[PDB]
Amino acid sequence: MVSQPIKLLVGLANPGPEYAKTRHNAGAWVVEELARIHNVTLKNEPKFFGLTGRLLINSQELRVLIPTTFMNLSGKAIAALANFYQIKPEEIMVAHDELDLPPGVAKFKQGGGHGGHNGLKDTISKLGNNKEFYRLRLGIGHPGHKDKVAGYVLGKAPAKEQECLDAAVDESVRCLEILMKDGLTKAQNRLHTFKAE
Numbered sequence: 001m002v003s004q005p006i007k008l009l010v011g012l013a014n015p016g017p018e019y020a021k022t023r024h025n026a027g028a029w030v031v032e033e034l035a036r037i038h039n040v041t042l043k044n045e046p047k048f049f050g051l052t053g054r055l056l057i058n059s060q061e062l063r064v065l066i067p068t069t070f071m072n073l074s075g076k077a078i079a080a081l082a083n084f085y086q087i088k089p090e091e092i093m094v095a096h097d098e099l100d101l102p103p104g105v106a107k108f109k110q111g112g113g114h115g116g117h118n119g120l121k122d123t124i125s126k127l128g129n130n131k132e133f134y135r136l137r138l139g140i141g142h143p144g145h146k147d148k149v150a151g152y153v154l155g156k157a158p159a160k161e162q163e164c165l166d167a168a169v170d171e172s173v174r175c176l177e178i179l180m181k182d183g184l185t186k187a188q189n190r191l192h193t194f195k196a197e
Helices: 026-038 073-085 118-125 159-181 184-191
Strands: 008-012 043-045 050-057 060-067 092-098 106-110 134-139
Touching (some): 008 026, 008 073, 026 050, 026 092, 026 159, 050 159, 073 118, 106 159, 159 184
Parallel strands (some): 008 060, 008 092
Antiparallel strands (some): 050 060, 106 134
C-alpha cells in the first residue's frame, strides 16, 4: 500500500470566517474539524505564516496547515514547512478546494494534481519538481451553466447545499484513519464512493 505514511497535510481554502462562508472553504472546513475531533491546538506560526495543527489519530500524527494567503503565501508556507520537516512528497498530502467535482464528493489524487491557480501549482514550483505530491479533492462545484461556473465556485452556499459539503468533510477526515490503517486504496475506495446523490 504505502511505503512512508503522511507526516504533513495542507488545506487550501478561503481563510477567515468572512470568506469561509464562501463555497471555496473546502480545505478550511476539514482543518478546523480535525482541530475539533482531536482537540488539538491549531498554532498560527509566522514561520510558515499559517495555522498548523499536529494531531495523532490511530497511530500516525497528522500535521495539517492552512496558509494565511491561498495565492502566493500558500506554497511558500508549504515550502518552509515541508523543508524543515524534511518530509517527502509521498508523505505530503493536500486537502484543497475543488470546483471540478460536485458538492459532497471526495477523491484521492496521486501524481498530477494542479490547475491554473498559483496556490495549487506553486506548492510544486516552490518545492521543486515534486510531481510525487498527494492531494485529495473536495467537491464544491455544482454543474449548472458551464459558462457561469465561476459564479458557483466562490459564491455563498446556503446551509441546505452546504450540508452536502459537511457530509464530504465528515468522511474526508475519518478516511484519513483508514488510509494509514488499511491502505490508501481502502480510503480511496471509500472516498469517491461517498457522494451526494
